Structures are given as structure tokens and as C-alpha cells.
């Protein structure tokens, strides 16, 4: 059960019923340049290292 | 014999065991359906008028076609007189009295 | 209990001259009591695609196999049918074309009888403005008769060796494409399905003849 870390490359947009989470396609530090999209609530910039508890998900955009 | 005819052959007056000169499907307007032949263990399924699929031998015989006189129960007897003459022709099967009465 | 520790492995041997004979490995329960280990193995089948039998041919045009018997920890299989993949069959079905179908029963040289199919899609020519590309349906009936007729005199006197040697490079489809252009330029005619429905006898001698 690994717990990995990831720094933000780009910011796609904001999502939620309250408009609170931010769909972030972050990147993978510990592996090669692969792509998953994560829902992050709270303020975030480009370069923020993020704590990931499960690197198996993928959020969708609209 | 049923081993000669192909499957789906509508026949009548067939035999249970080979050599009893015609037992199954002998009433008027009835037939059987021959299916499911076997190369080894010479058996043949026949669909009877009751709907049962009986496995029989492949050496017993059957006349090809249906029994003439089909539709005999289409006419209502329409009076007690024709039923009296019918049962007087057949046998004394008619003291039909209600068991409650 | 752990039944998979008790279960046995038989590897699958394809019949001769695909290119190779290795297919895979299957599980056997064991030989115990009435249930012999060769009971279900006589009835097991396989549905294996290409690019592992014909040395980098097209990935579609799958093949149906059935295990005939077992011979020294090696379960030997034999031809049972030939299909195509669902994505390739659903592809090349255009809304502005015509899909001509055919099917025919035929008996081989030996006692194997098979029902083989045929699909043919009409073709838009190069430098064509009319986007419809239909036919007068008499050419469609004529080409149904033609594609029903061609397969009869291929698979009339040809047993499993020659019909597999014809269905590997799609020589039937190329022959229909050659005899097809006089009627209409039909695009990518295939067979799409064929299955064995009559098997005469075990014939281990004919199986050894199939090997060589």
C-alpha cells in the first residue's frame, strides 16, 4: 500500500457543486512522465508537491 | 423401419418393441415425429401425440403418414342420441352418474 | 483444501504446418475415481487468434480448435472452425454501402461437412461524386449465386489440409475479388464464419497423417 508524492505541472479548472475542488493533472515524480487527473480542494499553484494516498484513480473533465 | 427414414418423418402406427405389429399412435388423426438417430446403440426418439419423447429401437416399423379420419372430435355430438349410438357401438362405458348425486 | 495445488497442467499442441505447434497450457483436475483426466480434455475447445500461428499475419481471422486426444502429457488439438474478431467484423460496415451475404453447406473429401459464410461490402470508386453506391439488386442476387457457387467447387474435393492452406492467405477472398470485378468492385470480401457440424470418426491415423 504505497503513499507517493507528486508536484503540479498544470491546472485545468475548478469543479464542484460549490466550485471548490480543482481538477489537477499533476505528474509522476517517482516514475516517468505519466498522466493522471486528480481532484484537489483548496488553493493550489503550479509546482505544489501533493500527497497521494492512492495513485490508481483518474478524474474526468467537462 | 425407423432406421431407414430421416429425422422429422411424420409416421403413425409404430411399434414399441420390434415385432408386436403396431401399438403406438393408432387413433384417428394422430402421428409421431421421428428424431435423434444413433449410429452405435441403435435407438431413435419419437415424439408421441401426448408430447412424450420416447426412446425406442431402430428396427421396429411404422406406416408413413397420418391416420385417416382426422378431425373426428371437431363436431359436437349435439344430442344424447348420437352419444347413445356411439357408446352402444363401442362398449358399455356409459353409466356416467355423478358421484355426489 | 487448496485444489489448485493438486491440479495438473497439460500443454496444447496445435496440428501441423500453421507455422508452429505451441498454443498454451491448460488445467486438469486430476485422474481420480470415475472421472478420468482425459474425460473433459476430449471435449475442451479453444478460440485463438492469429499473430502467434502464422508468423506476423493479420491479427483478426481467429480460429476455433478442439482437443482431439492427449499423447504423453501433450494435449493435441484439431480444427473446429474459423471466425473473425468482433471489432473487425463491426468495422467496414458503412452507412452508405451495401452488405451482400452468402452461406452454403458443403461436404469435404473425407466425412467432414461444414457451413461456410461470406460477406461482401460494396465499394466507392476513386473520383466518384455519387455517395450512394448501391446496385439494382439483380447484380446482388447474381453475386450471391456466384459466391455460393465458388465455395462449392473449392471445398468440394478438398479436406482439412487444403482448406486450411486456402484459408490462411485468404485465397477464397482473392478469388472472389478476381471473379467479382465484372459485376461490381466489392470491397474486402471475407468469409467471416465457418463451423464444423458433422464429424465422422476419431481417426488417429488420419490425425497422424495431418501431422506428417
Amino acid at each position: 500500500q504505497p503513499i507517493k508524492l507528486a508536484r503540479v505541472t498544470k491546472v485545468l479548472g475548478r469543479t464542484g457543486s460549490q466550485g471548490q475542488c480543482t481538477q489537477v493533472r499533476v505528474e509522476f515524480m517517482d516514475d516517468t512522465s505519466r498522466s493522471i487527473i486528480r481532484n484537489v480542494k483548496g488553493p493550489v499553484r503550479e509546482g505544489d508537491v501533493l500527497t497521494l494516498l492512492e495513485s490508481e484513480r483518474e478524474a474526468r473533465r467537462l | 423401419p425407423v432406421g431407414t427414414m430421416p429425422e422429422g418423418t411424420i409416421v403413425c402406427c409404430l411399434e414399441e418393441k420390434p415385432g408386436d405389429r403396431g401399438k403406438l399412435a393408432r387413433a384417428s388423426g394422430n402421428y409421431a415425429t421421428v428424431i435423434s438417430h444413433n449410429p452405435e446403440t441403435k435407438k431413435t426418439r419419437v415424439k408421441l401425440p401426448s408430447g412424450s419423447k420416447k426412446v425406442i429401437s431402430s428396427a421396429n416399423r411404422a406406416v408413413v403418414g397420418v391416420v385417416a379420419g382426422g378431425g373426428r372430435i371437431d363436431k359436437p355430438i349435439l344430442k344424447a342420441g348420437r352419444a347413445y349410438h356411439k357408446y352402444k357401438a363401442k362398449r358399455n362405458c356409459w353409466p356416467r352418474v355423478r358421484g355426489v348425486a | 483444501v487448496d485444489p489448485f495445488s493438486k491440479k495438473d497442467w497439460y500443454d496444447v499442441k496445435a496440428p501441423a504446418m500453421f507455422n508452429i505447434r505451441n498454443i498454451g497450457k491448460t488445467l486438469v483436475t486430476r485422474t481420480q475415481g470415475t472421472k478420468i483426466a482425459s474425460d473433459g480434455l476430449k471435449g475442451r475447445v479453444f478460440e485463438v487468434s492469429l499473430a502467434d500461428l502464422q508468423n506476423d499475419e493479420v491479427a483478426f481471422r481467429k480460429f476455433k480448435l478442439i482437443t482431439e486426444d492427449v499423447q504423453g502429457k501433450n494435449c493435441l488439438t484439431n480444427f473446429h472452425g474459423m471466425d473473425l474478431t468482433r471489432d473487425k467484423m463491426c468495422s467496414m460496415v458503412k452507412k452508405w454501402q451495401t452488405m451482400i451475404e452468402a452461406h452454403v453447406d458443403v461436404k469435404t473429401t473425407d466425412g467432414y461437412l461444414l457451413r461456410l459464410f461470406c460477406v461482401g461490402f460494396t465499394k466507392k470508386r476513386n473520383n466518384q461524386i455519387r455517395k450512394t453506391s448501391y446496385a439494382q439488386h439483380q447484380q446482388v442476387r447474381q453475386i450471391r449465386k456466384k459466391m455460393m457457387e465458388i465455395m462449392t467447387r473449392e471445398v468440394q474435393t478438398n479436406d482439412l489440409k487444403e482448406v486450411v492452406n486456402k484459408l490462411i492467405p485468404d485465397s477464397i477472398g482473392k478469388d472472389i475479388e478476381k471473379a467479382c470485378q465484372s459485376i461490381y468492385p466489392l470491397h474486402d470480401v471475407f468469409v467471416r464464419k465457418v463451423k464444423m457440424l458433422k464429424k465422422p470418426k476419431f481417426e488417429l491415423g488420419k490425425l497422424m497423417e495431418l501431422h506428417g
Binding site: 490508481e56 484513480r57 483518474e58 | - | 489448485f4 495445488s5 491440479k7 497442467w9 500443454d11 496444447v12 498454443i23 498454451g24 497450457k25 491448460t26 488445467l27 486438469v28 483436475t29 473433459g40 475442451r44 475447445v45 479453444f46 478460440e47 485463438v48 487468434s49 499473430a51 491479427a59 482437443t67 474478431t85 468482433r86 471489432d87
Partner: protein
């Protein structure tokens, strides 16, 4: 146990059926024949909630359990057969398989070619809904 193959380098193949539905997700590992089931973990075997057994999280947990059992029983490669409720229901697969393919490709389980062997009817047999069909 060593398993079927000694001195690895040749892939041991198995057929992995993925039955994706709107209410559940099946992942199933069989040999190349189609009879001997190797492993079978559904969505309800991993998620207690009945409303969340169709979830991609349920599909990933079932896929990780299936991949762990397949690594313990000693197979390497999987030919994936995707299917859905295609008789009269929606022919498109559910939301679980789209992440279950990722969950199989993550933890071992080298994927061969993938085919959509879905049961498709010939000529659109009688639908469960009715004249005016499902409402609300």
C-alpha cells in the same frame, strides 16, 4: 509450488473475462480453454455497500485481488475479453472496466490482445420496458 513453467521467459497465458454492467462488475480468470476457473472476485466481494459495488473503486479492488491470486498461482499474460449486458440492455460496458483495465495493467498481468466479445442479438428481440418504456 513452481507451477506450470520452469525457467521463465515464455509467457503463461490466461483468458480474463471482464463483464461490466451498470450494477456490478465481474473479473474472471480462466485458462485458454474456458472451463477451469482460476480466480473470480466480483464487486460485492470487495465492497460492503450495494450502491457502490458498480464503482470503479470496486473494480480496482477486485482486479488487484484477482491479480494477486494470479501471481500466487503463477500465470503471466492475459487475453482480455470485454463484455456487457448486451442481450437487450445497453451494449456499452459499465464504468468499472475502464479503470479495471488500468488496474490489471498496473500490478503485473502482461496484457496480450483485447477483444470485445459481447453477446449481440441478431435482430433486436423484445425489450423489457414496454410501449412508453422506463419513466423517471
Amino acid at each position: 509450488s513452481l507451477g506450470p513453467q520452469v525457467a521463465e521467459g515464455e509467457n503463461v497465458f490466461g483468458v480474463c473475462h471482464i463483464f461490466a454492467s451498470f450494477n456490478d462488475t465481474f473479473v474472471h480468470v480462466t485458462d485458454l480453454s474456458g472451463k477451469e476457473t482460476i480466480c473470480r472476485v466480483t464487486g460485492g466481494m470487495k465492497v460492503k455497500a450495494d450502491r457502490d459495488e458498480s464503482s470503479p473503486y470496486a473494480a480496482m479492488l477486485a482486479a488487484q485481488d484477482v491479480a494477486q491470486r494470479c501471481k500466487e498461482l503463477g500465470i503471466t499474460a492475459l487475453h482480455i475479453k470485454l463484455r456487457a449486458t448486451g442481450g437487450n440492455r445497453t451494449k456499452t460496458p459499465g464504468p468499472g472496466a475502464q479503470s479495471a483495465l488500468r488496474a490489471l495493467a498496473r500490478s503485473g498481468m502482461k496484457i496480450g490482445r483485447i477483444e470485445d466479445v459481447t453477446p449481440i442479438p441478431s435482430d433486436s428481440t423484445r425489450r423489457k420496458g414496454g410501449r412508453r418504456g422506463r419513466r423517471l
